[PDB]
C-alpha cells in the first residue's frame, strides 16, 4: 500500500516541477506595461424588489433582458430587466433553493437546493402556467450549482463531492464526475460547452470532459473552500472565489495559477465571481455587503459596487456586457451599468 | 407612453406582486423549527410520536399555531455551508438521549460537542434552543447498571436519577457561552405522547413573546 503513496508523492512532485518550469514570466510583469483601467463608476439602474427572503442565486437569459432569481421564500421570479416587471413567479416545492439556471433558449428554468433534486420548469407551455417538467433525482448532497448545457441535457454539481450530467428527457444521469475530496460548491461551462470546470470545498478546481467523462486537470493554490468559479470569456482561463478572501485566475493551457486578487483590508470570503464581456474586468461579490470590480490583468481594484445591506449572494454579467446584476441576502437585486 | 400590452404586462406584474405579498404574509405567521441531534437520539421516534433523501419537512398544528419542523439529519454533508440558510428559524429543537454511554467507536460527548457548536454558532445568536432529554424511561435502569462515574468523574452528587438528571441539565445549559442573548428550554420527554407538543408550544409562545418584547422595546 505504501508503494502507491510513494508513487502518488512522486507524481505530485513531477507535476510541481513541470508547472514550475513553465512559469517563465509572471502575468503581473508582462501586464505591467499596459495602461491601467480608471476607476469604474456604476450606479443602480434598477432595483428588483419583491423577494421576501435571502436571494441565493440568479441567472440571466441569453437575450440579456430576462433574469431569474431564487430565494429561501420559495419563489423563482423571472424579471423583465428593462422594466422591472415580473414575468413569472414559480412556487417551489421546497423553499431551500440554493441555485437556479436559465436555459440558453429561454424555454426552461431550473433550480435546486437542500432537497437534493434538480427541478426543470417549462416556461412556454400551452396551458399558460409554468409547470415543473421533470425532477432530476439521484444526488446524495445539497445542490450548489446547475447550468443548462443544452435544452435537453444539463450538468449539476452537488454537495456529495460529485458533479453529474443529466438527460432531461430520460431523467437519469448519463455521466458521473468523481474525484473531489470535498463537496462541490460551484460550476461553470466553457463557452464551447465541450468542457466545464467546478470548484469544491477541498480547495481545488477540476476541469472535466463533458463527453469523455473524465477529469483533465486539477488546479490548487487556494487556502480554503472555493465558493464560486467562472470561465474567462476566451474559454482558456477561469477565475475562482474562495473563503480565504482572494480571487485567483487559473489558465488551462499553462496548467497553473496565473494571478491572485487579494487586498489587506479584504478579510472575508467571496460568494460569487463573474467576468466582463471583454474579460478585462473580474467582478466578485463579498461577505462585506458589497462587490469589488477587479482589473483582471493588473489585479488592481478598479471600482466598488456598494449598496446592499447584507452579504451579496450572486451576480452575473449579461451576454452583451451591458449590465451586471447583484443579488444579496436582503432580498433585493440591483442592476448596475 | 406605455402601449396597450405594456400596460397589460404591468398589470400582470402588479397581480404577481400582490400574490407574492399575500403568500409572504401567510408564511410569516408560521413557526419554523430546526430539529437536530444524533440519528439514534430519538429524533424519528419523537417526530413520529408527536405528529398531529434530503431535508424532511414536518407540519403540525396546535392551538391555532402552525409549526414547520425541518429534520435535516439526512444531509450527510459538510455543515457551515448550508446551516446559514436556517438563520431565521424561530427556535432549535435539540434531542439528546441519556442512554448512549455503551456505544464507543463517546456518544454523550459527541452530543455535547454538537450542542456547543449549534448553541454558539454565529448564525444562532438569538435563536433559542429547546432541549429534549429523551430515553428517560430506560435511563432509570441503565444508570443502575452503570453509575454516572463512567461519564463524569467530577460528579459530586449521589448516583440517583433525581440528581443525575438535574446535573446533566445544568451541564448542558452551562455549555451556552452567551447566557443573555438566547435562552434554553429543557424537557425530559420520556417518550410521552401529549407533553412533547405541549412543551414545544409553550417554549415557542414564550420565545415569540420575548421576540415581540424585544421588537416593541419593553426588553
Amino acid at each position, epitope marked *: 500500500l505504501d508503494q502507491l503513496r510513494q508513487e502518488a508523492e512522486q507524481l505530485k512532485n513531477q507535476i510541481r516541477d513541470a508547472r514550475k518550469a513553465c512559469a517563465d514570466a509572471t502575468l503581473s510583469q508582462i501586464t505591467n506595461n499596459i495602461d491601467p483601467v480608471g476607476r469604474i463608476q456604476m450606479r443602480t439602474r434598477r432595483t428588483l424588489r419583491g423577494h421576501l427572503a435571502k436571494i441565493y442565486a440568479m441567472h440571466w437569459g441569453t437575450d440579456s433582458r430576462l433574469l431569474v432569481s431564487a430565494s429561501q421564500d420559495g419563489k423563482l421570479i423571472i424579471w423583465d430587466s428593462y422594466t422591472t*416587471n415580473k414575468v413569472h413567479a414559480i412556487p417551489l416545492r421546497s423553499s431551500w433553493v440554493m441555485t437556479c439556471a436559465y436555459a440558453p433558449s429561454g424555454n426552461y428554468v431550473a433550480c435546486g437546493g437542500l432537497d437534493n433534486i434538480c427541478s426543470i420548469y417549462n416556461l412556454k407551455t*400551452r*396551458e399558460g*402556467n409554468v409547470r415543473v417538467s421533470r425532477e432530476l433525482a439521484g444526488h446524495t448532497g445539497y445542490l450548489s450549482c446547475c447550468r443548462f448545457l443544452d435544452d435537453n441535457q444539463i450538468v449539476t454539481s452537488s454537495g456529495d463531492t460529485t458533479c453529474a450530467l443529466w438527460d432531461i428527457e430520460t431523467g437519469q444521469q448519463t455521466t458521473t464526475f468523481t474525484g473531489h475530496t470535498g463537496d462541490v460548491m460551484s460550476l461553470s461551462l466553457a463557452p464551447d460547452t465541450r468542457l466545464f470546470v467546478s470548484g469544491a470545498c477541498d480547495a481545488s478546481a477540476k476541469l472535466w470532459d463533458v463527453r469523455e467523462g473524465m477529469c483533465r486537470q486539477t488546479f490548487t493554490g487556494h487556502e480554503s473552500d472555493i465558493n464560486a468559479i467562472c470561465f474567462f470569456p476566451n474559454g482558456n482561463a477561469f477565475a475562482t472565489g474562495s473563503d480565504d478572501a482572494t480571487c485567483r485566475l487559473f489558465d488551462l493551457r499553462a496548467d497553473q495559477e496565473l494571478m491572485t486578487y487579494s487586498h489587506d483590508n479584504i478579510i472575508c470570503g467571496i460568494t460569487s465571481v463573474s467576468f466582463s464581456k471583454s474579460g478585462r474586468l473580474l467582478l466578485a461579490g463579498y461577505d462585506d455587503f458589497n462587490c469589488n470590480v477587479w482589473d483582471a490583468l493588473k489585479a488592481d481594484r478598479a471600482g466598488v459596487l456598494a449598496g446592499h445591506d447584507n452579504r451579496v449572494s450572486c451576480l452575473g454579467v449579461t451576454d452583451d456586457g451591458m449590465a451586471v446584476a447583484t443579488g444579496s441576502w436582503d432580498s433585493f437585486l440591483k442592476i448596475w451599468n | 407612453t406605455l402601449s396597450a*400590452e405594456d400596460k397589460a*404586462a404591468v*398589470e*400582470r406584474s402588479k*397581480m404577481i406582486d400582490r400574490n407574492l405579498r399575500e403568500d409572504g404574509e401567510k408564511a410569516a405567521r408560521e413557526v419554523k423549527l430546526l430539529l437536530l441531534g444524533a440519528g439514534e437520539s430519538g429524533k424519528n421516534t419523537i417526530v413520529k410520536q408527536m405528529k398531529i433523501t434530503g431535508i424532511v419537512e414536518t407540519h403540525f398544528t396546535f392551538k391555532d399555531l402552525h409549526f414547520k419542523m425541518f429534520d435535516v439529519g439526512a444531509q450527510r454533508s459538510e455543515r457551515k455551508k448550508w446551516i446559514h440558510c436556517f438563520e431565521g428559524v424561530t427556535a432549535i429543537i435539540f434531542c439528546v438521549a441519556l442512554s448512549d454511554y455503551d456505544l464507543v467507536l463517546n456518544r454523550m460527548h459527541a452530543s455535547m460537542k454538537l450542542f456547543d457548536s449549534i448553541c454558539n454558532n454565529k448564525w444562532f445568536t438569538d435563536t433559542s434552543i429547546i432541549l429534549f432529554l429523551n430515553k428517560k424511561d430506560l435511563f432509570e435502569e441503565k444508570i443502575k447498571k452503570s453509575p454516572l462515574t463512567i461519564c463524569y468523574p467530577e460528579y459530586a452528587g449521589s448516583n440517583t436519577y433525581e440528581e443525575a438528571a438535574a446535573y446533566i441539565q445544568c451541564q448542558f445549559e452551562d455549555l451556552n457561552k452567551r447566557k443573555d442573548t438566547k435562552e434554553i428550554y429543557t424537557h425530559f420527554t420520556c417518550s410521552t405522547d401529549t407533553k412533547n407538543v405541549q412543551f414545544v408550544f409553550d417554549a415557542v409562545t414564550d420565545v415569540i413573546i420575548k421576540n415581540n418584547l424585544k421588537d416593541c422595546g419593553l426588553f
Partner: single-chain antibody
Amino acid sequence: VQLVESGGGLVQPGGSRKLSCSASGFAFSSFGMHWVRQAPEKGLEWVAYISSGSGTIYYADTVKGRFTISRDDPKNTLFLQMTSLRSEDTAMYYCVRSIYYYGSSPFDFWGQGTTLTVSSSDIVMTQATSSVPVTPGESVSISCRSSKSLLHSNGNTYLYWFLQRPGQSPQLLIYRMSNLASGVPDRFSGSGSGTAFTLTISRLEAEDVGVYYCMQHLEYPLTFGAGTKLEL
C-alpha cells in the same frame, strides 16, 4: 386547450342575451379574454376585452354601454351580457384567448364561434387586394397598411396576422408582425416596416386556402382588416 361558447340564437330587436364562454384545458384565471365578432359575410370586429383579475375592461365604441363583459374565474367561464340588440349585432362571436407578458403570443387561441341572429380616431387598416388566385408550390405576398405607424417607441410593431380556414375559427399566424406563432407550418414569414406590412408564404400548399385578417394592437379599439381571400 379548448374554448367552447354558447348563448346564440334568434333574438328580437331591443332584446338581451348572455353569451357564455367555457374555458377548459388552460389557466383561465391568468389569461385576458377578448370577444371578437364577425358579421355573416364581413370581416372580424373587436367587441370587448377583460384583463386578468377583471382589473381593466374595454368595449368597442360601437357597443359601449350596450354590452357588459364579466368573468367568473372559479367557474372557469367568461360572460358577455348583451342588451338592446339591433340588426347590426347579428354576427358570429369568438371567445379569443389573450395573455400579456414579455414575449407572449396574445390571441393565440380562438373559440369555435356562436351564431347570434337578430331578426329584422381609430386606426384604419386596409388590405390592398380582396382576393388573389394561388397555385400550390407558388409564393404569395399579402400586403397590408395602417393609418398610423404601429412601431411603438419600445420597438415592437404591434401587428398580427390571422388565417380563417373555410368554416373554422381563425388561428394566429404572426404576432408583432415578425414573430411566428407556435404550431404553424413555418412556411409563413411576416415582415414589414412602419405603417407598411406584408405577409410572405413560401412553397404554398393545401390547407393554406382562406382569408387573412390583419390586426393592429398598438392601442384600443383593435381594428381588423377587410381580409384577403386565397382561391385555388
